[PDB]
């Protein structure tokens, strides 16, 4: 099932990402800089219940990091927005993968789904809804 997100990826199109970043208390520096980025994912997994992901973002932020999670298990995360006390948790929702961030008494969400070959992640904080679209490294 999750063998559909697995692979190599690359930014293609984004919209309303900086303002999202603001909704989640990021300084302008990081809202702009973060939107400015063209991140290159490297996604894979083991036993359809433990997904290992990577991110080579790039200029201007230079924050290359990694995810390593079990699906159904809450874990700790330290994003680039500099959030103290992020508690993630990722689920499988039909053909979609739902990544949820808890912090300071709030919840933001990432509904990722493959479509027309692209890894399309919709991002939801309050009334603010962002969208980005990735393509495989011409796989
Ligand atoms: C389902 C597989 C999958 C997973 C698990 C995934 C996770 C994922 N996607 C991103 C990129 C990444 N980077 C940022 C934001 C930034 N980028 C910058 O250089 C800066 C400074 C900021 C902050 C202002 C966000 C919001 C995301 C996640 C959204 C996305 O690109 O999908 C990160 C690191 C972001 C950070 O530094 O906080 C992670 C863990 N992406 C996928 O496709």
From Swiss-Prot:
InterPro entries: Calycin, Fatty_acid-bd, ILBP, Lipocln_cytosolic_FA-bd_dom. (4Z,15Z)-bilirubin IXalpha binds at residues 57, 61, 80, 112, 132-134. GO terms for molecular function: lipid binding. Becomes fluorescent upon binding free, unconjugated bilirubin, a heme metabolite. Can be used as diagnostic tool to detect abnormally high levels of free bilirubin, which are indicative of impaired liver function. Could also be used in research as fluorescent marker in eukaryotic cells and animals. GO terms for biological process: bioluminescence. The keyword Cytoplasm applies. Keywords: Cytoplasm, Luminescence, Photoprotein. Detected in small-diameter muscle fibers from the white muscle layer from juvenile animals (glass eels) (at protein level). Detected in small-diameter muscle fibers from juvenile animals (glass eels). It is found in: Cytoplasm. One of its GO terms (cellular component) is cytoplasm. It comes from the Eukaryota. Monomer. Forms a beta-barrel structure that accommodates bilirubin in its interior. Beta-barrel protein that binds unconjugated bilirubin with high affinity. Excitation of the bilirubin-bound protein gives rise to green fluorescence, both under normoxia and hypoxia. The apoprotein is not fluorescent. Does not emit fluorescence in the presence of ditauro-bilirubin, urobilin or biliverdin. Belongs to the calycin superfamily. Fatty-acid binding protein (FABP) family. This is Bilirubin-inducible fluorescent protein UnaG.
């Amino acid at each position: 099932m999750v063998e559909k997100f697995v692979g190599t990826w690359k930014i293609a199109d984004s919209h309303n990402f900086g303002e999202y970043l603001k909704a989640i208390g990021a300084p302008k520096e990081l809202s702009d800089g973060g939107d400015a980025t063209t991140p290159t994912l490297y996604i894979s997994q083991k036993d359809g219940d433990k997904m290992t992901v990577k991110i080579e973002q790039g200029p201007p932020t230079f924050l290359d990091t990694q995810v390593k999670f079990k699906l159904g298990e809450e874990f700790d995360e330290f994003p680039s927005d500099r959030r103290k006390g992020v508690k993630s948790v990722v689920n499988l929702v039909g053909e979609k993968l739902v990544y949820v961030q808890k912090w300071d008494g709030k919840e933001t969400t990432y509904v990722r789904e493959i479509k027309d070959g692209k890894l399309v992640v919709t991002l939801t904080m309050g009334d603010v809804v962002a969208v980005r679209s990735y393509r495989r490294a011409t796989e």
